[PDB]
Amino acid sequence: AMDCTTGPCCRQCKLKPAGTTCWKTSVSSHYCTGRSCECPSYPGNG
């Protein structure tokens, strides 16, 4: 049982706040939509 939702959008076990850089990968920067714990596959700067 793991309801933490591991991922880049998940600080560790809590859906990061929307409009907050979760990934910010040097090769690809994105943002969390406070909807899931998995950052999208697109940059959030528009």
* 39 close to 7: Cβ distance less than 8 angstroms: yes
Task: State whether CATH 3.40.50.12780 applies to domain 1-46.
Answer: no
End-to-end C-alpha distance for the chain, whole angstroms:
37
d(CA 13, CA 45): 25
Cα 1-16-12 angle, rounded to 5 deg: 45
| Technique that determined the structure | NMR
- In the chain, where are the structural domains located? 1-46
Residue at 45: amino acid letter: N
What type of residue sits at position 14?
K
